[PDB]
């Protein structure tokens with residue numbers, strides 16, 4: 001729903017608010033225009049009931065996002081931010097849609113498009129791994145489409161919060177365990193870069209086969225048991241792209257030791273071999 005007279009200031013710069021395009025418990029996202037009618041998304045986070053630990057995780061993610069955006073164009077831009085004791089405003093790159101919503105409204109995805117997105121994702125995640133950050137909770141919703149290019153929105157660093165404001169409402173894929181790796185389920189560090197490869201593999205599996213590998217299991221304890229059980233054979237239906245079949249089998253090995261790495265994935269023929277005549 002659009003906001004028709006609202007506006008906000010960030011570091012002495014005024015922004016017209018067109019509409020709200022998202023919400024967590026303590027947070028909101030707004031489609032906004034600056035003084036020169038350039039479009040942005042502003043993330044607002046209320047800090048009024050956040051403890052020092054939570055606060056410091058927000059501070060950490062902001063520092064890292066400000067640094068890492070210079071290292072890759074597959075991370076979302078953070079143009080400015082304002083940070084007080086009460087709130088954070090972040091002025092960020094705008095996208096017309098996130099990958100989750102895009103995939104919901106696409107049955108048949110173009111093979112070229114899928115490969116292009118796969119590359120974008122790999123480059124983003126590779127970048128955070130290179131600075132010691134394992135996201136540890138990658139879903140399609142963490143990726144924003146900006147003129148055909150996927151941008152990673154967050155680094156999984158910040159501590160999530162709950163609507164004790166209430167009037168409670170939430171979304172399809174926030175709780176989801178469909179992208180979760182076996183070692184995460186055992187775990188309750190032992191969090192390695194390989195955790196992210198499983199999650200990325202699950203996204204690619206969605207793009208290839210039209211669902212995540214354990215999506216069929218409604219019963220959430222049966223699902224978690226299926227993810228861990230070596231005898232539970234994951235399906236990989238035959239398709240023209242034999243390199244894509246290989247990538248998925250390699251990402252979804254349950255043993256993280258035996259599971260493929262991001263540098264390996266980047267040199268894989270799926271990413272590298274020119275299919276075009």
Ligand SMILES: CCc1cccc(CC)c1NC(=O)c1nn(C)c2c1CCc1cnc(Nc3ccc(C(=O)NC4CCN(C)CC4)cc3OC(F)(F)F)nc1-2
Nearest residue numbers: 021022023024027029031041093094095096097098101154
């Ligand atoms: C809530 C804050 C938060 C906390 C923790 C972690 C995270 C990251 C996941 C975040 N959340 C975030 O950090 C976050 N959440 N959103 C939604 C955005 C961000 C970052 C910047 C950003 C920039 N541009 C956009 N634009 C849009 C992104 C997605 C949609 C969308 O999916 N719409 C659907 C289209 C199809 N129909 C059928 C259903 C709706 C529409 C959008 O803009 C438009 F609305 F203007 F069009 N969004 C975002």
